[PDB]
Amino acid sequence: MASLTEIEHLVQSVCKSYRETCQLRLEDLLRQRSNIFSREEVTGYQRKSMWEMWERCAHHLTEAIQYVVEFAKRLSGFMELCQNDQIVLLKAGAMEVVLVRMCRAYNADNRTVFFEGKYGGMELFRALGCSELISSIFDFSHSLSALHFSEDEIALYTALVLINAHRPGLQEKRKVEQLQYNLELAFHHHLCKTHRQSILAKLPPKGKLRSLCSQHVERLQIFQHLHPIVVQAAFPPLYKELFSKILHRLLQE
Numbered sequence: 034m035a036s037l038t039e040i041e042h043l044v045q046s047v048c049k050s051y052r053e054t055c056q057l058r059l060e061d062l063l064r065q066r067s068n069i070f071s072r073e074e075v076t077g078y079q080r081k082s083m084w085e086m087w088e089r090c091a092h093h094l095t096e097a098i099q100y101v102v103e104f105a106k107r108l109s110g111f112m113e114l115c116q117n118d119q120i121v122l123l124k125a126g127a128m129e130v131v132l133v134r135m136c137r138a139y140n141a142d143n144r145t146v147f148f149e150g151k152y153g154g155m156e157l158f159r160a161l162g163c164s165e166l167i168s169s170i171f172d173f174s175h176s177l178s179a180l181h182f183s184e185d186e187i188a189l190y191t192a193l194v195l196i197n198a199h200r201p202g203l204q205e206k207r208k209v210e211q212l213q214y215n216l217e218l219a220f221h222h223h224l225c226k227t228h229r230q231s232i233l234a235k236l237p238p239k240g241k242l243r244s245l246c247s248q249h250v251e252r253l254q255i256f257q258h259l260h261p262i263v264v265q266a267a268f269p270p271l272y273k274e275l276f277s278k279i280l281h282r283l284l285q286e
């Protein structure tokens with residue numbers, strides 16, 4: 034049950050929820066493309082301490098995940114599932130949603146990402162000691178650039194990243210399956226109607242997004258083992274919660 038109106042109405046409320054919950058405006062990100070970090074500024078970032086860079090990136094990651102919580106809270110029928118399923122979906126999905134959202138701050142053209150006010154390439158994150166991880170993040174953004182996503186496509190796709198009935202630990206598995214289906218119908222209908230069905234074959238596999246979150250938790254478990262007090266005192270609580278009950282607080286406001 035759902036007609037060609039109830040499926041279409043979902044499309045526009047998904048695009049709306051997404052529009053209203055992005056950390057950065059795409060128009061803004063596009064106009065700052067020529068504001069690039071100097072050779073001296075890149076060298077300043079490389080000279081910064083690993084733990085300083087870690088705290089900066091973790092703070093920025095937390096900043097973005099907070100907007101993913103607001104996207105989830107406005108997503109049709111997400112607030113109607115149980116609190117345990119809301120956390121299950123956000124714990125597993127929020128990072129992946131930022132991993133897709135991230136492509137809007139990318140520029141395949143110059144291979145740079147927007148960070149702390151200006152655009153900069155992979156070598157801006159050398160201090161982190163995440164040679165392969167930052168590389169994967171950059172390649173993942175490069176691959177999504179090739180798809181030339183519309184904002185409405187990013188909205189429907191990210192909503193499907195978050196609404197995954199296959200996430201382990203889901204209590205009302207069928208209530209999440211029912212929701213995932215309507216969003217899939219809304220996405221594929223919008224792709225059909227816009228003559229953009231050809232993207233389906235080119236969307237990244239399920240494992241591309243899964244290995245990225247896993248690599249993040251692996252390098253984090255390494256950094257935390259060498260600087261445990263740095264993570265306790267300077268890392269954000271919601272960051273430590275997601276990768277190391279703030280989510281329950283966010284889910285009420």
Ligand SMILES: O=C(O)[C@H]1CC[C@H](C(=O)N2CC[C@@]3(S(=O)(=O)c4ccc(F)cc4)c4ccc(OCc5c(F)cccc5Cl)cc4CC[C@@H]23)CC1
Nearest residue numbers: 055056057087090091093094097134135138146148167170
């Ligand atoms: O408008 C929006 O909502 C979007 C605006 C743009 C936002 C965005 O680009 N981002 C939100 C924060 C940022 S970043 O700008 O700090 C950045 C960092 C590394 C990059 F390769 C590129 C960018 C980020 C932060 C941490 C991270 O992994 C976890 C992590 C740590 F935490 C700490 C150390 C190491 C790691 Cl690996 C990965 C990414 C990728 C997406 C990036 C995404 C949301």
